[PDB]
Amino acid sequence: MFENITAAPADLFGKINLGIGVYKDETGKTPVLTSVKKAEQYLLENETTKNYLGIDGIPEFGRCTQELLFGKGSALINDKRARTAQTPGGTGALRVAADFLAKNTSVKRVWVSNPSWPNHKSVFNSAGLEVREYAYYDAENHTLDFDALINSLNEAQAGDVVLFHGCCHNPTGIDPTLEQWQTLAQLSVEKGWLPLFDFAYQGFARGLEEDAEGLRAFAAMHKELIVASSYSKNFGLYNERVGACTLVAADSETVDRAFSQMKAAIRANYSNPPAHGASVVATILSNDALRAIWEQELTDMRQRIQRMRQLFVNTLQEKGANRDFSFIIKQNGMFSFSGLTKEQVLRLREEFGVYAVASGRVNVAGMTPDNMAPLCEAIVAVL
Amino acid sequence: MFENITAAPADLFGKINLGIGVYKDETGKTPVLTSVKKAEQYLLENETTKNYLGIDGIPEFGRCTQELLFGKGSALINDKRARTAQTPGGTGALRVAADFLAKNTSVKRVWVSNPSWPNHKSVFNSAGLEVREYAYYDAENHTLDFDALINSLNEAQAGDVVLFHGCCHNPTGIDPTLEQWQTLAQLSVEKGWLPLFDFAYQGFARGLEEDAEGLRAFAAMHKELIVASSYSKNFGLYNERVGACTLVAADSETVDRAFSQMKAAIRANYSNPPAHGASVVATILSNDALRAIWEQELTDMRQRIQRMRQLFVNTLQEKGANRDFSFIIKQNGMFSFSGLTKEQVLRLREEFGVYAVASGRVNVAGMTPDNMAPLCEAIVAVL
């Protein structure tokens, strides 16, 4: 049966990993958040069973997720228009959304930005959905090529899905402005697209509420949308696989009926979701004290990334770069394109032991005050 | 998009739940195992990061799983013929296997026993695989209808998958004898079936090693097989979603190449698996002290089920049943068919508040010395 299977298409790693996918603190570590440890100790002391969760996971987790996404008091919540399934990570949320759409709707294709996270194509294609790309990056001005984006998306037909990164676009760190999000929301309604928000970095651009402004501009204009969110980075819960798939429809009757088929898609995949990480999230978000500790830890990560963006720009200048890298200051989240070519990136790894991805994307959160000077010296050497 | 979606096809519950899917102790509780609490305290004290696991999960978890399945010193392990991916539960292992097979092999159909766990059909159909049924149950003799099974499976073609419950068949509790497993292994080789073992109850029939005898008889005769295993019941870790998909091929080169595509199927589903529950398993299985506490806790669950099987048979007689229920003593695991009809089961729920599934399957682990007498009185009343 297996003898003819084709193989599927860090190890190589004063050397430095900017190819990492995770947050690192100033010491180069990815520690467990203190809020998370406190919540884990509470669960150890208080859990009396590991009995299965419902298919959609812990109810409080769903409520707290919807409030993060839509705002406390949003009409979507008051009108019972949204249902949330706790999932194994943001990836699991994307796949649940893809399976739900493939089996229950006429969707055949999903539009993704060029560039995006490379696993988007794999997830949607696994569910039998075609992926098409829309233009996104203006490399000359280090910017969102908004005209190109709108022009590309003219090819999208009514009933296609269009995937939007809610904030901290991966890999570019370039997000629509609020007015651009409002333009896209109106366009989406007029053209009949189903928006799919992928929200893996809420809190890493400007703040929890500000980072959800784009999603909320969409939610104010659409009867229907899906959000696949992740708590991997903003709780540092990567390996516990904590995410959510939130379905929104015109009314409660419709969302509940549609959500029954989303639950069927989950039940045929992994049955019901892993409790530990989501229970840590729900414990923290529903407790004033733990929530305040967690919000500060997330602010500290957001701010450290900001400081590294500024220090990187200042240092490249001091090590003799010459080039404008000011665009880095304005970009959001852990990632940016450095503007290095694939060969410069290869040189960086081979000659200098500095790792980035071939696109030139760098994880700013891999930079620290201690490694900044060698890092920038290496980059200057390959310009 | 969603307005036309059709709805997908405990709540109703001296009343008694035999419709439950979980183990209950003598007090009617499903507590966290002591070995599990001890391991969770160790992880709270010792974990320093939640950084993502590899796609296939924790290496020690995989090694300990293969030793449970195949035996320490098995040739499959020595020859590096098996690869294990840690998955979100036994369901996740089944779905990973189904996606792997659908995308990478000529498999189009999977043979499942009639009866089986109802989610088997949903998982395989979700991956685009047809499900066909083979005969299994001799209800007159309360037994495995082995001739019917072999006759049904004659319709299976070379390259079809045949799913076997490794022990504690769900719902019947009727397992092949060792010699029957040996007959099926030889038949499977001759007919070109790919065996898929679903092993959710290892340790609940006779013991860890004895319960794997059937799988090991297959493994001794086949170049290729897949095992989807679960630690939900034997560690009481239901909601932490702890299972494994183990791929076996003729040699290391082939299994590694095939496993790369299994990892691709995982990466497009949930990316990488949830650490907490699997880390508890690996912590326990790799530690002599915790392993001994856990093995005794599992023996205690196995034995309590045995005691309830005997007490149920004895009590039905004492409450005036008359019928032979001796078959219950011989069956394995938490489940058996009571031999009640769908209408007797409905009567039991409506008139007596005793819940079972419509097939008449009962969870023996829902029985306790305290509820046995009313339970049996109710059953006698509906005969």
Ligand SMILES: Cc1ncc(COP(=O)(O)O)c(CNc2csc(C(=O)O)c2)c1O
């Ligand atoms: C846009 C987008 N969507 C979904 C995800 C998946 O989140 P999790 O599955 O890890 O929770 C992620 C993040 N997952 C991720 C891990 S490493 C990484 C990277 O791009 O380096 C990305 C993401 O960036």
Ligand SMILES: Cc1ncc(COP(=O)(O)O)c(CNc2csc(C(=O)O)c2)c1O
């Ligand atoms: C034969 C078989 N295969 C797979 C599974 C899935 O295990 P988990 O996904 O829960 O780990 C199970 C058990 N899962 C399960 C939960 S309730 C239940 C039942 O039949 O009542 C069954 C099983 O019996």
